[PDB]
Amino acid sequence: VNGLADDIQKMKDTYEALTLSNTDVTYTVGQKGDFDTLNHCFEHIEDLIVQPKSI
Amino acid sequence: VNGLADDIQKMKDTYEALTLSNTDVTYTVGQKGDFDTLNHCFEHIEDLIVQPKSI
């Protein structure tokens, strides 16, 4: 079941990265931000399949 | 659960874009390596749709 969940999450990440290449994205880093710490924020950016227009 | 796995496989087959991955890689060149010559290895690299995080 965990393998299936991992496959679902990876496919969702790939499609979200693909469909938002043209968009311009904003990640908020902080206590209430999208990411808890800066290093966690840039681990997500590194993992993107296709980088967007501007972050 | 087997039905869910079959659904995942069918949708991976139908949408080929979701198969893309940028995990790290290690192509070995030699007589019995992955690629026959160094030109082939870097010809295949330029053919990758998405460049992995490190090669």
Next chain:
Amino acid sequence: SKHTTTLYEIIESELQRLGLNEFVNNDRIHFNDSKHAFMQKMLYFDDDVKQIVDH
């Protein structure tokens, strides 16, 4: 627990009050996580269990 409760039941109740969950965790379900399960936590004497006992 045929007459009165056990220490394990009280500690488990307080841990559940704290909001912890042993199965689902971070979107991957494990029946016996060995890291977030209430057992294998009061045996390693985590900080939460020590706070509960001191309370």
Next chain:
Amino acid sequence: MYINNGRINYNNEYGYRRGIYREPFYSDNADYNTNSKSYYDYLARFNGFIFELCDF
């Protein structure tokens, strides 16, 4: 030893009982203590509800 072909299926080759009869693989001449919930656990559940009501 081969993979389950990517599909999980549950089967018990060596089970305790086969229909009405009993298989010889496992033993029954053992007695285990069974510990159920006492009145204090009923009180604990009622106190949990009262705690939620107080929070509301």
